[model samples]
Target chain A: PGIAWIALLLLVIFYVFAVMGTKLFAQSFPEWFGTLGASMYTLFQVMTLESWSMGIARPVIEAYPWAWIYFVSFILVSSFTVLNLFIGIIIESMQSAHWEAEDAKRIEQEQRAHDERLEMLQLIRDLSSKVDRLERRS
Target chain B: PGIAWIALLLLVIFYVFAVMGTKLFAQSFPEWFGTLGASMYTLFQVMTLESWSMGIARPVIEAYPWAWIYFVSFILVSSFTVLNLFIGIIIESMQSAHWEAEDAKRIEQEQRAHDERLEMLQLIRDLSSKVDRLERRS
Candidate 1:
């Protein structure tokens, strides 16, 4: 073969074969699975707002025991499991080919658009010197 | 399949395919690709924002249409295309182990890089020839 193929192989002996293996875990499963997923997303959106409320942040920080509950509920329980399950399955299923074809079509479309823009620029160059009495649309 | 299986499927779709899709599109394009994604996200943000912005119930007659473009582009058109393309390609090219997308992407990148390298080599060769013609002392 003219091309010597190499993969930047990663080792995962003890690294659990799961969703967390890919970039999909935290986002895919944990965000929108079921009631739990819905709630976690709710809390996620809430935390974004809550972090902004100056007084709210102070209150949350000071309430040690209450904050513990929030952390445990949001971080430790359902979200982790959902995220992991989602990510694990995805990694197990993925192959590199489908993505490659998809990428080709997208790039081809992009190149066509780029060429069109360049052609338009060249056309504009031909009509370079515009005069006051010139036909703008004509 | 049960709800768990369905959720798993969704998780894989989101985490594996979507994550890769997002990265690939972003790398390939800037304005159109990014805007397509952004518009969808904006629509969702507004969907929830509508209720939160008012903070209470309003009479039916008073609710006016707004955030319309953002909603239409991302939530409607962009999402429609994504779903259509996903299922379309999956059906059309599934037997090859879902590798077309990745292979196409790799080819496009290699082609671009190879072109650049060839151009650079030509330029270097030209410069080297010029150097050969002119002695170091002269």
Candidate 2:
């Protein structure tokens, strides 16, 4: 459930880049940025780092010299920040689940120790009662 | 350190598959499997799932029908098994580290409880001594 939000954020970033790419490069790179969907698909390919440089970015940059900035920034934000956050959340959830089990075990141990202490106190009270009876007899 | 063994096993599997691919497919697919190094590179590309089918496997399968089995099995073994094992070990290590911290806290808590119980027992013993003194006076 928590991961859903980060995924949505990534989608938003993808959508933003897709729209921007379509607006900026659609004129020259119609096959890749012909429509919103086309732009999104191209952006996804770039995100995968699958021949992104040689196939899409380099060609786009050949026409638009400043296009590398857009591709590089999108790759950094999407691949490094958002994707790593997904892994971080998963790892944290795993550790938290383990902690819950450890907490249960700790509580059980404490309960057992508490019971033993109560029993020991009861035995001490019994001794006190026997001493009282002896004093009464005296 | 323990993860090194699993990584070595994955590497060995990779080496075996690369050698097999080179021996089996080199005659037909020289660009991808002409030599051990080329085969290893192509296999790594397949492991990443980047155009594995459309780019490499489909072309090879066109010449050798049985080549699909090799590609599919390597994908399953390397991508699904060994890659997931890497994730599993990382998650396990994170949880184990958390467990160590939890264990330390539990020990501290238990030590405090034990000391309190010992103090309680000493107080009871003092009461017992007072009762004995009273009986002697009587």
Candidate 3:
């Protein structure tokens, strides 16, 4: 739940980049940017950094020198967003687990203390009663 | 410290695979397995799954039908080992952080309860003394 928003943002960013790549490079790199699906798949390949430069980006850059700007920006935005999403999910889970354990420990501690305090109060009451009895006898 | 051992294991696995890849494919695919460094770089590419099949492994498998076993094994071992390493590090860090916070909270609870108990005991003792004095006067 904590990371759902970021996940949505990442998907939106991927969609926008896919659309832009299809528009910008479809004429020259039809095989890669020929359609929406092609562009999305190629962008995913780029995100993985797998031959992203040597195989896909460099060849595209050869035709359109400004293409690097688009690739770099997409990589930066998508990678950082995904990284934060990962961290956010991990932290959320860890905190929830920690809180549950802490709550259990706290309840146990409080219950034990309450019982002990009650016993102590009872002992004091009995002692007071004994003193009252002694006072009456005297 | 907890992840150091797994990291070392990953490095050793990489070295072993790099040497094996160089020995097996250096003659046919010199550009990729031409040397130790080349094989390591290509293996890293495979590990990242970037064009691993279409760019590197499929072509290699064409030359040596049995080469799929090598690539598949390396991918499986390296990927699983790296995944466990990631999980190990995250778990270790989370546990340490949780322990620290729990320790602090437990100490505070214990200290507060200890103080309350001490005060209660003192009150009872004072009452006992008053009773003793009254008895003596009578």
lDDT by residue (A62-125, candidate 1, tens digit) is 5333444543443344344434433443333243434455556668866865665565454444
Residue A57 in model 1: lDDT? 23
What value does the lDDT take at residue A102 in candidate 1?
A: 56
Worst 10 residues of 2 chain B by lDDT: B79-88
Task: List candidate 1 segments past 4 Å from native.
Answer: A1-58, A61-66, A76-78, A92-138, B1-138
**C-alpha RMSD by candidate, in order:** 24.9, 7.0, 6.3
Query: DockQ for each of the predicted structures, in order?
Result: 0.03, 0.17, 0.19
User: What ranges in model 2 sit over 4 Å off?
Assistant: A1-108, A131-138, B92-97
User: Which segments of candidate 3 are over 4 A away from where they belong?
Assistant: A1-45, A49-54, A57-85, A94-112, A115-122, A125-138, B107-138
- The TM-score values for the models, in the order shown, are 0.22, 0.58, 0.59
Give the DockQ ranking, best first: 3, 2, 1
Tens-digit lDDT string for candidate 3 (A69-119):
787688768977876677667867777877676668887978798788878
lDDT of 1 at B80: 36
Note the clash tally of each candidate: 21, 0, 0
TM-score of chain A of 1: 0.29
Error of 1 at B17 (Å): 24
